[PDB]
Structures are given as structure tokens and as C-alpha cells.
Amino acid sequence: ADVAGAVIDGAGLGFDVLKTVLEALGNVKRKIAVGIDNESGKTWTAMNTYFRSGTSDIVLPHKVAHGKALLYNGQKNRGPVATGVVGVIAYSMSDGNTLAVLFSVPYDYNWYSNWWNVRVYKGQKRADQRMYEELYYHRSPFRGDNGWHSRGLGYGLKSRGFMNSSGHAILEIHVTKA
Ligand SMILES: C[N+](C)(C)CCOP(=O)(O)O
Ligand SMILES: C[N+](C)(C)CCOP(=O)(O)O
Ligand SMILES: C[N+](C)(C)CCOP(=O)(O)O
């Protein structure tokens, strides 16, 4: 089966492949499978993931051509620590701007919920705490509510994505030319 870390045909991205990626992480309380389909017309080059909470043992897929999707994952920090998997993925686009994707899969659903977001930043900006705070608090993230959400991104692009509500999370995003 396709694995986290791979770049696949973007038409092959879907819940089945992400479920498999999520299952392959085994028995961990909070974990996420992330798939982002690049149909933007331009190549993305990975910069970094800012992990606010949690970690990954997967290399952030380096080059993602138009027509390809990346597969990735993250998991809570090891041991009983009551924290989840929360972070921002940042890819450079060939126009000199940055594609940023927020994911948040909190430890405690009594206080918090799943959220995600997608935004293009002007210039080359590495993912960091400031970007996490902007995307989570101020830039209208979407709830992981087991439903799809669309939004135009500017820069000739639009996004359509889905995230479920539970702590074994899947996040599937398609970035297409608007
Ligand atoms: C809930 N949060 C997203 C604001 C902070 C991080 O959550 P957690 O990793 O402590 O659960
Ligand atoms: C602060 N806390 C993480 C122990 C519980 C949640 O409080 P709040 O951040 O929902 O106000
Ligand atoms: C994410 N948010 C800051 C826009 C809404 C509040 O969500 P949460 O932190 O209470 O789960």
C-alpha cells in the first residue's frame, strides 16, 4: 500500500489510502494521516513542519509536481503526556510564495476540537509558532467536522479539504487552480 512519505498520483488520494496510512501508525492515542493533492499547475518544494505538539518519523516529501499528492503523518509525543498532534506544514511554490497547512488534533476533546486550515503566504516563510497562532486563532480555520470545506486562496488557487472529528485523524486537501 502507499505509505506516508511517498508522492503518489494525485488522482489516487482519498480516504482509503489515508485510512491505511493512519492504521499503519498502530496503537497511539492521537495521530494523523495527511494527504495534499497538488493540482496547482506548479511544483511544490517542502520546507518544514512546525510541530506545536507531537512528532513525525517521516521525511516531509521533498518535491511534489503538479498532478501528484503527498502522503504524510504525525503522532503524539511518546508516553502518557496529554498532548496531541498539532502543527503547520509549509511548502515553497515556484512563484516564490508559501503554501501553509494547519492541523490540530488535540489531546483533550473536553476542551478542544480538531481544526485545520490552508493559506498562501507571500514570500518564503518557514512554518513556526507565529504562523500556527495566525492559522489557528485568526484566519478562520475549519473544524474537523467530518465534512468538506472549500475556500479560494488568492494567487490563482483554491482549496477543498476534509478532516474527521476524532483523535485518529485524517486530513485530505486538494489545491486546484481557480
Ligand atoms: C489545544 N491547542 C491546539 C490550542 C494547544 C495544543 O493541544 P495539545 O497538543 O496540548 O492537545
Ligand atoms: C487549561 N487546560 C488546558 C488545563 C484546560 C482547558 O482550558 P481552555 O484553554 O479550554 O480555557
Ligand atoms: C480554533 N478556534 C480558535 C478558531 C476556535 C476555538 O477552538 P478550540 O481551541 O476551542 O478547539
Residue numbers in the entry: 2 to 179
Article passage:
The crystal structure of a dimeric form of FraC in two crystal forms at 1.57 and 1.60 Å resolution sheds light on the initial events leading to the assembly of the pore. These two high-resolution crystal structures are virtually identical to each other. Suitable crystals were obtained in the presence of POC (a compound that mimics the lipid headgroup of DOPC and SM) and the detergent dodecyl-β-maltoside (DDM). Two molecules of POC are bound to each protein chain, occupying identical positions to those of the headgroups of lipids L2 and L3 in the crystal structure of both, the transmembrane pore and the DHPC-bound monomer. The protein–protein dimerization surface and the non-covalent interactions observed in the dimer resemble those between residues of the β-core region in the transmembrane pore (rmsd=0.4±0.04 Å). The structure of the dimer reveals a localized and notable conformational change with respect to the monomer (water soluble) at residues 14–17 of the N-terminal region. In the monomeric form of FraC, the side chain of Phe16 is inserted in a hydrophobic cavity of the β-core region. In contrast, during dimerization the residue Val60 of a second protein chain displaces Phe16 from its original position, leading to (i) partial unfolding and increase strain in the peptide bond of Phe16 and its neighbouring residue Leu14, (ii) a displacement of 4.7±0.1 Å of the Cα of Phe16 towards the solvent and (iii) further structural adjustments of Gly15 and Asp17. Because the N-terminal region is glued to the β-core region, partly by interactions between apolar residues, the rearrangement of two large hydrophobic residues (Leu14 and Phe16) may facilitate the detachment of the N-terminal region towards the membrane, a necessary condition to generate the active pore. Second, the serendipitous capture of a dimeric form of FraC exhibiting a similar protein–protein interaction interface to that of the pore, suggests a mechanism initiating the self-assembly and metamorphosis of FraC.
Fragaceatoxin C (FraC)11 is a potent haemolysin of the family of actinoporins, defined as a group of ~20 kDa protein toxins produced by sea anemones. Actinoporins are classified as α-helical PFT (α-PFT) because the transmembrane pore is predicted to form an α-helical barrel. The lytic activity of actinoporins on biological membranes is enhanced by the lipid sphingomyelin (SM) and by lipid-phase coexistence. Here we reveal structures of FraC corresponding to four different stages of its activation route, namely the water-soluble form, the lipid-bound form, an assembly intermediate and the transmembrane pore.
